Design a protein around this ligand. Sequence first.
Ligand code: CU
Ligand code: CU
Ligand code: CU
Ligand code: CU
Ligand code: CU
Ligand code: CU
Lengths: 285, 285, 285
Amino acid sequence: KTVQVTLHAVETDVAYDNKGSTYRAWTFDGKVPGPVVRVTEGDTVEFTLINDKNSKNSHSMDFHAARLDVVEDFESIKPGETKKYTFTADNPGVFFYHCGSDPMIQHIARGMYGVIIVDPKDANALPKADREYVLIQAEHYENPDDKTAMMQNKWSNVVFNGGVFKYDPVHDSEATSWLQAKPGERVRIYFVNAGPNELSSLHPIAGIWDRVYPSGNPKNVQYALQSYLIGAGDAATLDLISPVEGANAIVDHSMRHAHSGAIAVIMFTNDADPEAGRGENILIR
Amino acid sequence: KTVQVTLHAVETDVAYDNKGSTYRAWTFDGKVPGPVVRVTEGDTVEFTLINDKNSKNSHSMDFHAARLDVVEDFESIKPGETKKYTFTADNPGVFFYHCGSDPMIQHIARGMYGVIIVDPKDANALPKADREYVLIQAEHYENPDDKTAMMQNKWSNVVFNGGVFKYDPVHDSEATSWLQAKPGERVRIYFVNAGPNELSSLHPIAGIWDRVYPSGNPKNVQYALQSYLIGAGDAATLDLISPVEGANAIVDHSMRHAHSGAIAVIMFTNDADPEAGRGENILIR
Amino acid sequence: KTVQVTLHAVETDVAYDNKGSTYRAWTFDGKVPGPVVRVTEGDTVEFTLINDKNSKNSHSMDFHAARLDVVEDFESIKPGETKKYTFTADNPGVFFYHCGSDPMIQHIARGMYGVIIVDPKDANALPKADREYVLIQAEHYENPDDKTAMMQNKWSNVVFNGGVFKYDPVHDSEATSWLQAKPGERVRIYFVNAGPNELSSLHPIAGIWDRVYPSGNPKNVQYALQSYLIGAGDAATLDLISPVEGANAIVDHSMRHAHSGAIAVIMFTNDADPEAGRGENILIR
Ligand SMILES: [Cu+2]
Ligand SMILES: [Cu+2]
Ligand SMILES: [Cu+2]
Ligand SMILES: [Cu+2]
Ligand SMILES: [Cu+2]
Ligand SMILES: [Cu+2]
């Protein structure tokens, strides 16, 4: 099928922690991360980018699910301009998308990143998930204008979905979000490491990855991994099943990253919200 | 089968180099790394942690081989307290274990780490090994109380099994340990990267990894790798066979790590000690 | 078959950017990277190293394709000396070679590195490539004599084949080289991360890796990867096919690396040079 996707490059204030501290973000659609894009393998994506008239910078769009021309297709457009391009999603899995404007380190760091999920055309290629969650790791830099600090990898926090300990109510009493599932259910994590710079060594504390799929591709399946290494600009699908009620903590096991905000708690309970990890709730905002 | 495993959280002085320099370590059973734990896939482990009465800190236990509740099972216990929990080793391979107390970065860095080996139930899943060796990489931090330096990744050394160049008699004439095998023998390395922060790019100088198993699982086999990337908090099983007498040097190929202590020499000779890499000698102390 | 390979350890000035800035390099055969060595699986390599009489340092040779003795075979030789050793290339793929002299961090960083390609004995193990290109990543350090800066990972640039933005005429107007292919052709990238310290997260902007082979081995094939992580001292074979005319940009997706020089443009055109990526032109100098 043919799907139409329109995103707006918007420069606006967004929250980055649980106390409501704000940041001068650059975004797709006024939020960090950008909207989840979801298509089926083989679908035609008609993409439109609108750079908001109030933006002070040129912006662009790069989909890792696209096979196109970097020069013409991923070109930067000025505030007030609109760009269109079309691509087929040739490969199933999970893919990073981000602004490709100069310099990419800053456009990514300021929040212009998201995920495109490409469901396999074969519905039985992956085992059936009972829950799905999107987690996108990124480094947070204190001064969004300081490109030197970014080049030197001097981040202040490492976060999931734009927030320091956004999903950790165990550590942070001010955290208001967490992942939910029932014991025995297959929880599918769509993970993207946006970077811009750092690696992620993703581990579920008190659990194990049942299956891991590099780039989300069913052909690359690995089994029963305690940890999985996701480079900057890479993505994977990771399945998790708890045999008991309680919690796991999804962490970047590079402890300095974890202690800086990269911990997401999943609660396994018999009374899990039936709407959690389903429909529009896969990226918890 | 059901086995019983008791470990003691002990805060004590241990040596970290070949000239007998000491460190105020936090340990399992007064040694770094902790005792090797070894079970068969499917086994029930009845675990007991005793926090020594002389400890000044709360401690805990996290097994990557366990599927439990992070909140209740991996909880911290005070000096003088005893905690018990039970888990089944559901998956074969090699798994990181460590203290999960606040902050994990420091508890790991000070020496509270080890390995649990889970032998496959199918005795023919892995090719028969003639030697087995445990190698655990960690960063050594000069001041064990300086949590800031740990957060900033300012380590002094990168070590195998708690010692700077512990297994490198070629470079350090004061080194008294090395790995042993005969030419043609299959040497199985159980490798754990304890971190807390850094990645390991493991390479046998003058050799090649015959086979590598991510998380030690037979299902994930990769062949003839010159190097293998092990993230912080990850583990793998790596097989090595030398066709000749001589030496290989197992290194973290990120050279700054290798030069800071991450080199382990394996000697291939016809007169190799029949006790080496067998029974109780797999982690050479 | 038996092949004879002679390399000279030569200390000489080489260019490292597009304005002809020079560096006091340590090299094999007066160039960075060293000459491409290419053999067939099972071949016998009779290797000779000649340390140039005017060298001020001892040098050596370490092939990741060799299974030998680090002590005797990879030993350092003085200026004016000649060393010989023989090895069989037992495993097919792509392998790092470098000087193994003290300290390796500096010998690698100053330019003593290259690639050995070992073609599979089974000519149908890999799909047929229409183009082949060698790309070797390394960190460039401003002061070649400053070993502390190297140990602290304080590089100035991250480069492909010894040059800052060597293959990026889109960004740098002074760049005179780029990769070439026609749409629909299978482009095979032989990639080596020489380091000495850093990891590479390799991604083709506006493309996807059709196939990736860890250590270039056909047995380890992975499919449709947006990115692939190559540790320091590791190598991989990565296949790329563009369905359209235009360009892809091969980048280390850790953005601070890319912005510091790690970007190589491949141009897909109907009028691509029939000599490009073939015969003697696989490593573009
Ligand atoms: Cu932008
Ligand atoms: Cu990207
Ligand atoms: Cu502890
Ligand atoms: Cu852990
Ligand atoms: Cu040298
Ligand atoms: Cu090497």
